[PDB]
Amino acid sequence: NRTHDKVISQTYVPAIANIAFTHLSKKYPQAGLKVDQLNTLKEKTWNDLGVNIEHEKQEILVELSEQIFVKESKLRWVHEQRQRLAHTTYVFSGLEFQNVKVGFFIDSYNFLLQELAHRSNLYQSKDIVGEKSFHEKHLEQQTAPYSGVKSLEEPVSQNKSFINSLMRAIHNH
Amino acid sequence: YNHLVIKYYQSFICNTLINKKKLEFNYILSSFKFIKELNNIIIISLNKLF
Amino acid sequence: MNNTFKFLHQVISKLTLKAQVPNYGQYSHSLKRPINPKVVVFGNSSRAYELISSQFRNFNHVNGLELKGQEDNIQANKVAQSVLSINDGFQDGYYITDFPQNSKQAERLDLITDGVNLALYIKDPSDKVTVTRQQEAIDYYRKTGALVEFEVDPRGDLEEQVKQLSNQVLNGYKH
Amino acid sequence: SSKGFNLANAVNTVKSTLNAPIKHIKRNIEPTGSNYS
Amino acid sequence: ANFVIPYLKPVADFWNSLCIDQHQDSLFQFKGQTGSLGTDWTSKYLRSEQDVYNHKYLQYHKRVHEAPELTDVISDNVYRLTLFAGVERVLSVRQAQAILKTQFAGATENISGAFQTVLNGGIFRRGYFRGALLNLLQFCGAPYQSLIWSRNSGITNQVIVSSIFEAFFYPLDTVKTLIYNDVQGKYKGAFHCASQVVQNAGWSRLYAGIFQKLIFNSALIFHLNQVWDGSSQQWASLALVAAAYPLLVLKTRFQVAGTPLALATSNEVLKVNRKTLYAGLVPYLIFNTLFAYEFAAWHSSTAQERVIGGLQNAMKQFSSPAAEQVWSS
Amino acid sequence: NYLDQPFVKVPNANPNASLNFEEGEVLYENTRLLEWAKFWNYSVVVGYL
Amino acid sequence: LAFIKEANEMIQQNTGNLPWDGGKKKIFQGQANKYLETPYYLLAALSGLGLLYFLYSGDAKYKTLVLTPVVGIAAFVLLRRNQILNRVPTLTELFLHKDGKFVDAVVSVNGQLISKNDIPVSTLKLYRGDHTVKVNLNDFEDASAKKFLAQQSGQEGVINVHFSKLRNLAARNGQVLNLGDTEVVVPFENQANRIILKQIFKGVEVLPS
Amino acid sequence: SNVTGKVALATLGALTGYGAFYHYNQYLNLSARWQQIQENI
Amino acid sequence: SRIYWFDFNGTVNENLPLNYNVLKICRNEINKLEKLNENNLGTQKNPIKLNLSFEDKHYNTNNLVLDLNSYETFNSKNFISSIFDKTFESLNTVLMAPIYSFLEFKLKLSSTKINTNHYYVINGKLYITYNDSFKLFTTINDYFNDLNELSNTKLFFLYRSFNIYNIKLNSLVDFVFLKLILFIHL
Amino acid sequence: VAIYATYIALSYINNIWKDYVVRAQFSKDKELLFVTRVSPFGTTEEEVYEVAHLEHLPPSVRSGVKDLSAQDADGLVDVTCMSSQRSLVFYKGDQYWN
Amino acid sequence: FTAVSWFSIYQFARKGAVLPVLREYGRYFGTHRLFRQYLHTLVLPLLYTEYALN
């Protein structure tokens, strides 16, 4: 009943739950939506709580995008928030969460946030420098300049010879 | 119904923007009659059969 | 989201991300650097200055201490104008010092310039003015997640400190 | 008009290619903690 | 036998047709005699052995003394169009790289950089084969109509006809160049690119570089005739076309200018750095030498003599080395 | 029968409740190994065929 | 140098820091989404004709008899969805006057540019959430359509439909802005001056110049 | 798509006109050859 | 012309490397102090005085009127009549290209890189000529590393300037997977 | 012969590639290590290990230390899981390490 | 052999590497080591070929 699979990061789940519960309590003061009840609220459905999440979904998404700051994303905060808002609204426009639990909505939003962060990081660790690719190494090697022959460039009478001048023009161009 | 509502909303927005005062019902009801008749006859046939 | 579908979703997402950023798996390292790097540097120690000079050789300095006294909006606008251009030398990186001094200025600059690419703080025990001057800005950058802290020991190894700072700033760069 | 082929770069790449599998060969042929007496 | 072999049989048949002599197999498929000697297997094999050179000669004669066939011309130039279609795109990118943005997109200003720029989009419509169908259409156009209207003609007449047809079909060349140099998928197709060009600039925008394309085409036709004849002056003509190559480079740059795909305009293209005029000259010469157009309809008398002499020399092999010289035959 | 050991209990099929499987931070990452393995495996398969 | 100039212009456009372009200053730059509809219409017509020909002849297979209706239905649904998505008024550009109290806009409707002027900033309002759209059934001249809409809505002649059910194909790629009396779609992927944009959307009037 | 339609129509017209000219020339040549063949026969 | 001394009345912070604009101004004043002749300005006791403002030190340039994604407009210059001049100039350029190459090769023979000097000592710090300004020079390896970094930036600018909001396919994939999971939950 | 040759080849290629580590990530409490390794077809395969079990063991033969890949700055480090009797191979290059 | 040697010498001289064979400068005309290496690479193999054939 419990596998050896890494669970999605829960760092922002408390913040998402707090923001959503605050916004929903602004409309349903008696709903009893509190952060301390997340462990028990996630097991109930919106119908049981008498809350129509469909109407407030867009406002919840906007508030979450404007409030939550993710430091794990590779994009600056403004771009990250705008991209998160667009992605979340597009994904949730076709999803009806009314008949499912609050935990499903919270986990879906957290998964979207984590996937956006991973895509921003290019599905690679942000704290690992990594190794350059073959193309990067080749481009750096090609961009590296050519030193040439310093002996021919050295100021000497012998270097004024026609043969030496030809060699310098051929090898130090 | 959702498609019809969206088409009506878009037509109203466009007519207000352009000062036309007439809704494009030809576009709002693109295939409403056909879809409704097909669904109704299918449902009636299924009810008669089963 | 689901254990059974996690692998398939990851594979499909990796395949699709190439459409947005072609050859991302081959140019991931280079992409770590932004197009127009904007850095805000906190720290006024001698070792901090040496590290800044070593790390930002190809960047342009922006002394924000000269803007003290003017209102936050004007200061932010001037900083944005300074750091939203590329010189003939093709140096697109700018690092600011002694600015912002408060959360209002920090937020104004971020809104004008779409955010600062990096906020590098060098905690040097031999420094006692940075915390007194720009604590609010440091707190704002910590909140926004653009803050990178690199503690420096004055009696440390300069080369190792420079290498660590370069790696940390490269990792912390944001688009 | 950036320059293209360079024999020195080619030789360096060949050396890197030939030296790449040395670590793997060493790891494969090295001893381990086990002593199957 | 009912679900795999029926679908797999055509593949094996195509493989065998490619890897076996179709004429020899057809000859062997008929067994017996009707009243004439020479239908046995031994006699058929002896005939089929020389039938290769006989059919080569007959095909060459058809391409010269009969109206040209588009299928035959495409078969002759299959490699230049089928497998190495992207070579044209990479050559165009190299030629126009002087005023392109490729050097800022993980590419170098060299043939390797052009190849990498072309291949970064894959092999398909956005990659190596981007514009392959346009290249095929252009080949089926002026280069083929010119053969039709100038079969068995001199160098001057061939050049004039080719110039006329290239002028007639030039806009396709400009569209193909723009598609080749479109590395960000700005244009969704040939029609989209042409529509954008016409909407932004006038119809004359499609005829940029025509007068520098025509002269290079004349030089290329001269070199093709020289190499077909096989005279020693083929190297001099190769040098001449190498010298005229900057005309082709300027044509490509003019076509690629005046658009978001390029950093320069028509006026600035003319005053471009002179050190990059011969961009991709050696790659272009190598590609042309390896896959020169096999237009047998334009082969002169000397070229036909060379081909027939080679065929006869190959045909002479069918004599017994140790045949006895007898007083009475 | 073989699982029903006389003196010692066999390990539970599920992980201990103490363990938490929440992801932390990445220590090591060499993604190009996947590409190298795919290349080598495909090459050996093609050669063997 | 040419690339440096182009990059500087791109950075300025992305940051939305354009100067005053004469009488008005551009503070928004957005683009609409285009979807394929002619290929789907052609595919649906081909599927219908093929089904009719198969029924007339009688030489078809069960496999194709199953597949062709499915392909035709999918093509028809995709065509309807793409038509609805394309015919969505999407705000393309917005300019503010020098006085800061008037705004002009240009919107795209299925690739057609429509220009609206004399829009006081006090009337602008960005819908953070899903608003409500009012539909008047009395306007409809089709009895069957009116009856169907009334039955589905379960309301009076004037029916209010929440925008949550409509955002799937109405504003799935943007927010909803109120340009006075009309409503437009503001895409998320756009270049705009955020400082002025937020104030005008909230309705506050910026200072002159 | 007015510009695209005009461009496509112009291309079709040019190709069709070239085809008409080629077919007219071929028809003249074939008629002359057929008359010569009939006379010879 | 290597050693020169500049003095700023507190308007330039020397604790950090000088800005590109500041170095450009210094070069533009040295190219006058050299060519126009010298009143013995630039020594420690007789330095060059400068009062640099924030705009001068920071602002890059002006005339940002380039129109992105634009096509040159024809049919107004009478291309039919003007193409002759362009063709003639192209022919002249093609004819002269071998001659220009030969002349440049001869110039290389008669010229050497060491002939020109590009090193200047300012405030006891060595600088090397850079495009239109100066660049601090400390070590050959450091200079080569700086050149490599500049080349890398120029090369990967376009790749790094990718579209953040082009996430249609990713959003579609996420939506499909979450809708399947929602069906499972229902 | 064909079936078993193909099976043996694929299985032994997978076994050879199993030792190498593609990715390693600690848990939130740093109590477990999730390791992504190579699959038979070159994809990612997940496994879990315990940091306490993980250990770097010296070679059984004491004269073979000089022959270890770890002698090279860009060699390989062989980390042994003492519980699962498995080996984890990591590149010594700092580019691959957090 | 001459072509390969000339190509290698040219590439290594472009990269700044010159084999330490022959004097750096000539005793009489002061010809450069690269030029004399080219001359030797061109001449010596021809003489060796002639001697071997003879």
Ligand SMILES: CCCCCCCCCCCCCCCCCC(=O)OC[C@H](COP(=O)([O-])OCC(O)COP(=O)([O-])OC[C@@H](COC(=O)CCCCCCCCCCCCCCCCC)OC(=O)CCCCCCCCCCCCCCCCC)OC(=O)CCCCCCCCCCCCCCCCC
């Ligand atoms: C004897 C008589 C001869 C007579 C003729 C002589 C002619 C001489 C001509 C002059 C030659 C001068 C020498 C230098 C030339 C260099 C090339 C050059 O000039 O080009 C410039 C340019 C230089 O490159 P660069 O990036 O600018 O700079 C290079 C770096 O500086 C370099 O730095 P780097 O770090 O990049 O180094 C690259 C490379 C440097 O190395 C080399 O490149 C040297 C290679 C030497 C050997 C080459 C042999 C093959 C050569 C080709 C053969 C065919 C020729 C046909 C010719 C025409 C015939 C009609 O480094 C390596 O060595 C890499 C390691 C791997 C090497 C190869 C390993 C082989 C292993 C073999 C054994 C395998 C295991 C077997 C056992 C197990 C069981 C099987 O090169 C190119 O751009 C080349 C482009 C070639 C394009 C070819 C056409 C492609 C078409 C693609 C079509 C795709 C279609 C897809 C369809 C899909 C449908 C689904």
Ligand SMILES: CCCCCCCCCCCCCCCCCC(=O)OC[C@H](COP(=O)([O-])OCC(O)COP(=O)([O-])OC[C@@H](COC(=O)CCCCCCCCCCCCCCCCC)OC(=O)CCCCCCCCCCCCCCCCC)OC(=O)CCCCCCCCCCCCCCCCC
């Ligand atoms: C070390 C070695 C092992 C040691 C231990 C061994 C222990 C004993 C194992 C005994 C296994 C059964 C042996 C049966 C021998 C053949 C009997 C026979 O005459 O039946 C054919 C017989 C054809 O006779 P026919 O109608 O006179 O046609 C004459 C034609 O010349 C020919 O017909 P056609 O030309 O019209 O059609 C050509 C071709 C058309 O070919 C195709 O359909 C294309 C390819 C289809 C997919 C192939 C997948 C291959 C990948 C691995 C699959 C693993 C097993 C999957 C099992 C799925 C079902 C649970 O059709 C076939 O030949 C049959 C299709 C292939 C079916 C193979 C997959 C199903 C196996 C079912 C039995 C095993 C149950 C599960 C065992 C545990 C598995 C973990 O089939 C029919 O009754 C009509 C077709 C529909 C029913 C097929 C029934 C199964 C046929 C099995 C074929 C032989 C392979 C069996 C083993 C597969 C791997 C485990």
Ligand SMILES: CCCCCCCCCCCCCCCCCC(=O)OC[C@H](COP(=O)([O-])OCC(O)COP(=O)([O-])OC[C@@H](COC(=O)CCCCCCCCCCCCCCCCC)OC(=O)CCCCCCCCCCCCCCCCC)OC(=O)CCCCCCCCCCCCCCCCC
């Ligand atoms: C093989 C067996 C059969 C052999 C037959 C014999 C061979 C010759 C047959 C020739 C006849 C074929 C039948 C007729 C074809 C007709 C095509 C046609 O009309 O298309 C038009 C064409 C289509 O429009 P478009 O699609 O928008 O543009 C093309 C795209 O750019 C797309 O171009 P792309 O180059 O980017 O394409 C990349 C390529 C990427 O893929 C590849 O290239 C892969 C290559 C792999 C290697 C090759 C291996 C060997 C072949 C294997 C084949 C396997 C089967 C393939 C089956 C494909 C599906 C059928 O494929 C694609 O991605 C294509 C995009 C798909 C949509 C469009 C094409 C649909 C498919 C048609 C295929 C037909 C092929 C037939 C011949 C066989 C070709 C092989 O448009 C134009 O050409 C417009 C030109 C406009 C020029 C500017 C005009 C300006 C105004 C002019 C004013 C004039 C008056 C001025 C007066 C001045 C004062 C006097």
Ligand SMILES: CCCCCCCCCCCCCCCCCC(=O)OC[C@H](COP(=O)([O-])OCC(O)COP(=O)([O-])OC[C@@H](COC(=O)CCCCCCCCCCCCCCCCC)OC(=O)CCCCCCCCCCCCCCCCC)OC(=O)CCCCCCCCCCCCCCCCC
């Ligand atoms: C087998 C190995 C190779 C395999 C290749 C792959 C093949 C695969 C199958 C086919 C498909 C692929 C097709 C090719 C793809 C590209 C390959 C590639 O990478 O190559 C490019 C690659 C260079 O590309 P890159 O690295 O990008 O270029 C670097 C720069 O970007 C510069 O590039 P750029 O484009 O900017 O050019 C500017 C130009 C700038 O320079 C100029 O334009 C100088 C202008 C000076 C003007 C002076 C004027 C003075 C006044 C006038 C005096 C004369 C006229 C007087 C008249 C008076 C009376 C009227 O630069 C040059 O001139 C130098 C360019 C490179 C020269 C390469 C020479 C190769 C020689 C090979 C050995 C010797 C021949 C052996 C033959 C026998 C073999 C058995 O070429 C090579 O390195 C070698 C490639 C292979 C060579 C094949 C041999 C030549 C065949 C054709 C010509 C035959 C001789 C004809 C004359 C003699 C007859 C007796």
Ligand SMILES: CCCCCCCCCCCCCCCCCC(=O)OC[C@H](COP(=O)([O-])OCC(O)COP(=O)([O-])OC[C@@H](COC(=O)CCCCCCCCCCCCCCCCC)OC(=O)CCCCCCCCCCCCCCCCC)OC(=O)CCCCCCCCCCCCCCCCC
């Ligand atoms: C990939 C192939 C999978 C085959 C599965 C086979 C299962 C064997 C079970 C073994 C246990 C014993 C069963 C009883 C004995 C079976 C004997 C036997 O093998 O007879 C087969 C029977 C023998 O044919 P035949 O006697 O030679 O008559 C020749 C006539 O031309 C035939 O023309 P006809 O008009 O007389 O056709 C009669 C038709 C009448 O049908 C019936 O047999 C009764 C009705 C069954 C319901 C489905 C009818 C087919 C409608 C289209 C598929 C709908 C999706 C659901 C399919 C569920 C599985 C059938 O029978 C069929 O052909 C039924 C199968 C056709 C399937 C075609 C689509 C392939 C993919 C299917 C799976 C897709 C994923 C499903 C996931 C789960 C969804 C819940 O039919 C076949 O040959 C079936 C295999 C055909 C393979 C080649 C297809 C054409 C080339 C590929 C086209 C790919 C693109 C287009 C399709 C894309 C996907 C939609």
Ligand SMILES: CCCCCCCCCCCCCCCCCC(=O)OC[C@H](COP(=O)([O-])OCC(O)COP(=O)([O-])OC[C@@H](COC(=O)CCCCCCCCCCCCCCCCC)OC(=O)CCCCCCCCCCCCCCCCC)OC(=O)CCCCCCCCCCCCCCCCC
């Ligand atoms: C059959 C003819 C075949 C000809 C083949 C082509 C190559 C050879 C001829 C080439 C000629 C044109 C070359 C281009 C010229 C460009 C302009 C220029 O600046 O010159 C480039 C350059 C000189 O320019 P540089 O910048 O002044 O460089 C000076 C460096 O010291 C030079 O340093 P290095 O880097 O060159 O190295 C020194 C040099 C080695 O040079 C030595 O110092 C070695 C001396 C060995 C002496 C052995 C005992 C001789 C006993 C008396 C023999 C009497 C004649 C017997 C004849 C028998 C029948 C054939 O080379 C080597 O050590 C490496 C190669 C290994 C030795 C292989 C030598 C084979 C020579 C085959 C041709 C011999 C022709 C003899 C003609 C008659 C002479 C009377 O010329 C050469 O590199 C070619 C040198 C040819 C040999 C010179 C021998 C001088 C000592 C003669 C002693 C006996 C007579 C004394 C008379 C005293 C007054 C009464």
